[PDB]
Amino acid sequence: IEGGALVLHYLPEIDMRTGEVLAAEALVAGELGRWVLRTACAEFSRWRANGVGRNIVLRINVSPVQLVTDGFVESVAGIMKEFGLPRGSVCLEITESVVVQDIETTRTTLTGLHNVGVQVAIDDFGTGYSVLSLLKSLPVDTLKIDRSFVAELGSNPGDLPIVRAVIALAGAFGLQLVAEGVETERAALTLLRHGCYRAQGFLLSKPILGSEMQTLLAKGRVP
């Protein structure tokens, strides 16, 4: 929506054991979607300015079109410095559908971002292109288990072997885990049993306005 300016919503990512909020996924050249990125960082530093969300990470969905456009890191780097955001506080979620040439260029960008203290995550994991291959080449930090897998996690026994295998990969690759699409208590408890404690989903929390997040972050926890 437009208020003359962009109205972003923020999907909280929580520790499911404690209920504690650990991060917030910001939801909504030619494609100057750094406008989204810029708005999120501004709203994020605002929380930080108010002594809230100091220890949490801001997650922004970044396109591969957005990525590897020359002077992409210059913006991400500058944008963070602009709003006094410290290292590790921003994590760019990249789609698994990289499906891009210059895999070296992609790798130099990701390492480039790490030099600038920016984490990277694979969004919608298991649904894109070259799912398993990417794990070898790209120095990412976080994995995000797609809606698809978490949806019927408890109900279908057939989802668990897959999820158990994905968790193994993350563990084996030294990658942080996040489950997205937790809409049931069954999936919730199953993710906990097998060692996936970070998650997002309608059961846990809904996309909320910047002000609403700041309030939630003031508590620092949810049921």
Which one of a copy of itself, Mg ion, none interacts with residue 93, CB within 5 to 8 A by kind? Mg ion
- Residue 10's SS3 state is strand
In residues, how long is the chain? 223
Residue 128 touching a copy of itself (CB under 8 A) = yes
Q: In 10 A of CB 207, how many CB atoms?
A: 18
Residue 168 touching a copy of itself (CB under 8 A) = yes
Catalytic residues: 180
159 is in an annotated binding site: no
d(CA 141, CA 118): 10
Residue 127 touching a copy of itself (CB under 8 A) = yes
d(CA 35, CA 6): 8
d(CA 16, CA 95): 24
Residue 93 touching Mg ion (CB under 5 A) = yes
152 is in an annotated binding site: no
Which one of a copy of itself, Mg ion, none interacts with residue 123, CB within 5 to 8 A by kind? Mg ion
Stretch that binds Mg ion, among 28-36, 89-97, 103-111, 164-172 (CB under 5 A): 89-97
Q: Which of 135, 192, 203, 208 binds a copy of itself (CB under 8 A)?
A: 135
Nearer to Mg ion, 65 or 218 (CB): 65
2 is in an annotated binding site: no
Q: Which of 25, 93, 123, 159 binds a copy of itself (CB under 8 A)?
A: 159
- Residue 21's SS3 state is strand
DSSP bridge pairs for 6: 2
Q: Binding string to a copy of itself for residues 55 to 94, with x set by CB under 8 A, is what?
A: ----------------------------------------
Residue 104 touching a copy of itself (CB under 8 A) = no
Residue numbers after which the chain breaks, C to N beyond 2.5 angstroms: 28
Nearer to a copy of itself, 46 or 164 (CB): 164
Which one of a copy of itself, Mg ion, none interacts with residue 63, CB within 5 to 8 A by kind? none
d(CA 220, CA 156): 33
- Provide the Cα torsion 48, 213, 28, 183; round to 10°: 130
Stretch that binds Mg ion, among 73-81, 115-123, 149-157, 170-178 (CB under 5 A): 115-123
Please name the residues in contact with 57: beta carbons below 8 A apart, sequence gap of 6 or more.
22, 23, 24, 88, 89, 90, 91, 119
d(CA 40, CA 59): 9
Q: Which residues bind a copy of itself (CB under 8 A)?
A: 96-97, 125-133, 135-137, 146, 148-149, 156, 158-159, 161-162, 164-166, 168-169, 172-173
